[PDB]
Amino acid sequence: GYAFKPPPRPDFGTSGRTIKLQANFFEMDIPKIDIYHYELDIKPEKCPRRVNREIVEHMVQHFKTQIFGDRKPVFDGRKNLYTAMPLPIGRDKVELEVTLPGEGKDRIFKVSIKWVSCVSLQALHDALSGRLPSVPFETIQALDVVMRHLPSMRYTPVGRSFFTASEGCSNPLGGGREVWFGFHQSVRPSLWKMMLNIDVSATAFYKAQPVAGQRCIKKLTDNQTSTMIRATARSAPDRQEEISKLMRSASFNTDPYVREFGIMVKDEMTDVTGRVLQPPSILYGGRNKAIATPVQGVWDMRNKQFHTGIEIKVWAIACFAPQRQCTEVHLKSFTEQLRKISRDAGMPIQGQPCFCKYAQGADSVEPMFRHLKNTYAGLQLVVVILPGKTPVYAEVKRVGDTVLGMATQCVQMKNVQRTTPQTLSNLCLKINVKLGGVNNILLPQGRPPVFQQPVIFLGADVTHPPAGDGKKPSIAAVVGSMDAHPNRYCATVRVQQHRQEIIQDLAAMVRELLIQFYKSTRFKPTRIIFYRAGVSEGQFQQVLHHELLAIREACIKLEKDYQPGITFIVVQKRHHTRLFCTDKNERVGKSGNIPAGTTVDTKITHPTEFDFYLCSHAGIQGTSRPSHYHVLWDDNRFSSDELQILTYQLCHTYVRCTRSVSIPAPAYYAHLVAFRARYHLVDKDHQALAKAVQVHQDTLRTMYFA
RNA sequence: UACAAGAGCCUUUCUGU
RNA sequence: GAAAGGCUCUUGUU
Ligand SMILES: [Mg+2]
Numbered sequence: 208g209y210a211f212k213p214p215p216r217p218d219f220g221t222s223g224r225t226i227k228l229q230a231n232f233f234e235m236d237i238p239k240i241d242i243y244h245y246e247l248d249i250k251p252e253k254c255p256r257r258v259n260r261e262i263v264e265h266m267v268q269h270f271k272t273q274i275f276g277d278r279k280p281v282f283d284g285r286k287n288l289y290t291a292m293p294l295p296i297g298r299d300k301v302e303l304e305v306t307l308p309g310e311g312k313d314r315i316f317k318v319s320i321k322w323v324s325c326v327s328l329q330a331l332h333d334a335l336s337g338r339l340p341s342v343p344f345e346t347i348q349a350l351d352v353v354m355r356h357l358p359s360m361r362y363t364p365v366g367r368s369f370f371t372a373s374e375g376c377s378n379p380l381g382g383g384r385e386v387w388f389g390f391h392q393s394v395r396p397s398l399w400k401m402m403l404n405i406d407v408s409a410t411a412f413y414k415a416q417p418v419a420g421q422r423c424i425k426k427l428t429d430n431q432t433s434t435m436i437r438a439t440a441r442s443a444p445d446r447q448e449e450i451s452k453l454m455r456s457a458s459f460n461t462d463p464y465v466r467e468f469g470i471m472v473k474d475e476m477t478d479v480t481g482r483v484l485q486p487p488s489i490l491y492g493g494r495n496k497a498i499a500t501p502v503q504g505v506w507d508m509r510n511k512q513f514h515t516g517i518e519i520k521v522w523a524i525a526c527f528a529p530q531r532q533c534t535e536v537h538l539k540s541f542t543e544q545l546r547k548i549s550r551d552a553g554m555p556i557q558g559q560p561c562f563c564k565y566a567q568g569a570d571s572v573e574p575m576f577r578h579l580k581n582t583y584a585g586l587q588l589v590v591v592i593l594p595g596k597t598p599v600y601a602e603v604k605r606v607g608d609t610v611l612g613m614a615t616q617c618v619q620m621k622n623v624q625r626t627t628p629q630t631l632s633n634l635c636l637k638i639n640v641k642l643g644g645v646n647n648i649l650l651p652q653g654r655p656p657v658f659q660q661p662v663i664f665l666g667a668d669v670t671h672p673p674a675g676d677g678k679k680p681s682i683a684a685v686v687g688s689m690d691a692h693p694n695r696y697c698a699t700v701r702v703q704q705h706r707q708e709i710i711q712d713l714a715a716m717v718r719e720l721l722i723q724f725y726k727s728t729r730f731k732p733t734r735i736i737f738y739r740a741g742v743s744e745g746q747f748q749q750v751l752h753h754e755l756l757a758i759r760e761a762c763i764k765l766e767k768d769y770q771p772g773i774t775f776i777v778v779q780k781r782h783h784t785r786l787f788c789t790d791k792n793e794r795v796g797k798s799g800n801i802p803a804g805t806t807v808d809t810k811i812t813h814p815t816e817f818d819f820y821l822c823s824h825a826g827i828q829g830t831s832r833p834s835h836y837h838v839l840w841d842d843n844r845f846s847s848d849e850l851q852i853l854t855y856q857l858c859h860t861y862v863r864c865t866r867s868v869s870i871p872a873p874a875y876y877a878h879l880v881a882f883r884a885r886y887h888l889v890d891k892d893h894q895a896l897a898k899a900v901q902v903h904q905d906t907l908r909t910m911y912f913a
Numbered sequence: 914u915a916c917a918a919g920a921g922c923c924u925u926u927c928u929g930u
Numbered sequence: 931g932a933a934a935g936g937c938u939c940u941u942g943u944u
Binding site: 438 | 917918920923924926930
């Protein structure tokens, strides 16, 4: 076991304006009776699940008198069976025989019943309301099996989801593909009661025309995914109506396999009271030092200059696109437009580029870049025109970031031939950040009280190669804020063993980031806020145990008797929690989604632990997915309001756009550093790969990854 | 490879068949 | 269930 438990909730959030919401969680009436856990062993071990459930029903209907009495038990399909009342077998094991036909053959099955444990729903009710510190996971799987018994028979199971055939609304897609509609069904705990999380979904099947229920797994063209996008395009009201109609049609409250366990489910979505946090003010620079107010999570840079602008004296253009497509007229027009746009933004580009020549292939990247470095003293930036996807991008990134230490920016050919003010403005944001300047900062007086002391913000993420591997290693990236502003971040990366979830060398990189912070700000951080991405809920305990100890070890290696407060937050942006507006007057945009800054820490979240949802971004397509934040550790004793406000404001510090993003800036930066390090390994034994992801000394202290 | 966000194919594969 | 990765597509935007 581990000795680090996640902290409980300090309080509930109060700040922000109240918004009425409806989450796709359905209240569950769980009785206090004890249900009984069994296990079924069937030989051989390669039985189909369909005939497994069929022979389970055959035993129930056949051996009714001997064992099963008058009960209807539930089965997950593979191993374990549950019954609401105890079968008269005690600890005994009974071997029975099942006769079945086959595809021209005959099958004889042997089946055994074994008692396992007595799981209690009273203990679950105690754990759901501040009595037991841990929700009993065995009870959760038992309840999930109970509620997914009949969907596994009426519909066709697909993973954890059930898909039914489309009636009337069938999309032919292409060939024999269809648009079979279904839903993900899961059982989640909450402080108030048990919740049935249900989200609507669709996938291709093979009912076709001259056996139905065959899911598509083969390969086809790109037209099918576009047609399925057009068929399944659902805004927030569309998903809300689909899930509500699905729950009204399914009717769990009339299922006999649910009634024997004495369970009621609510047919309506749970009403949850959210709060829309106000956005921070964005302080720009230049002459006016204009202040931008994010309206619906989006602001602009019109009549605004960078907080610190980098004047570009000498720059180069390396066009790897063909001359006949990307001409000199296009390059000159792009240069003039970029110079005027950057002059508007407080980033003056003085004069024409020193170098502007064409090149071909990734083999020419290193000699051309070496010539650029050795010929033009004081060179600040090389613009790389690329003809779409190419290995030239990976070679350029490897040469500029790890080999030569040259700041480079890649632009597609299509964005040079046809320029837009927004593309050039976003480019200028990238250039200003890549050249050492800061675009904007949070308003220092509009920031939470955490910023009144030296505080570093860390973001971590691990990218793993797909399984069936082991020559390809995993990459762990950690970034750290470098001022009280925080908008500039230093990046540290490591290569580690394949498919490893914890960060093995976290202490070394956190030590490097702390050293860089102490160099840049001349102060050690009194508070370390650690945003960790890509950690599953099962891995929470081992990830916390390894990584909190690694952070403490790094702080000790920095200086004796140096133990700053650490907050460990795990970001999960992939889940099935969907939030909708109860009233139409609070829907935002054509997608009708919740406004940016909507935070939920009630009634759908964890019973006894510091966790919350925050939709910091403004959804413009589909239904917004609010990022989930779980506080695995908190030495600083953050209030809920302060932590949520800080998270939202950190989501407002992303430098690549004038937008509020779904996750805070350090987590996004760690993700980008992991992707960049993956690009650095394209040319590729651990020491050869540890040296490959190591960026140049002139590249280490800048935001190459932006 | 201007950027954000949301979905689908598709890929290993734990499998479930 | 998940690594998120590709492949796109959509909304687009100063
Ligand atoms: Mg990642």
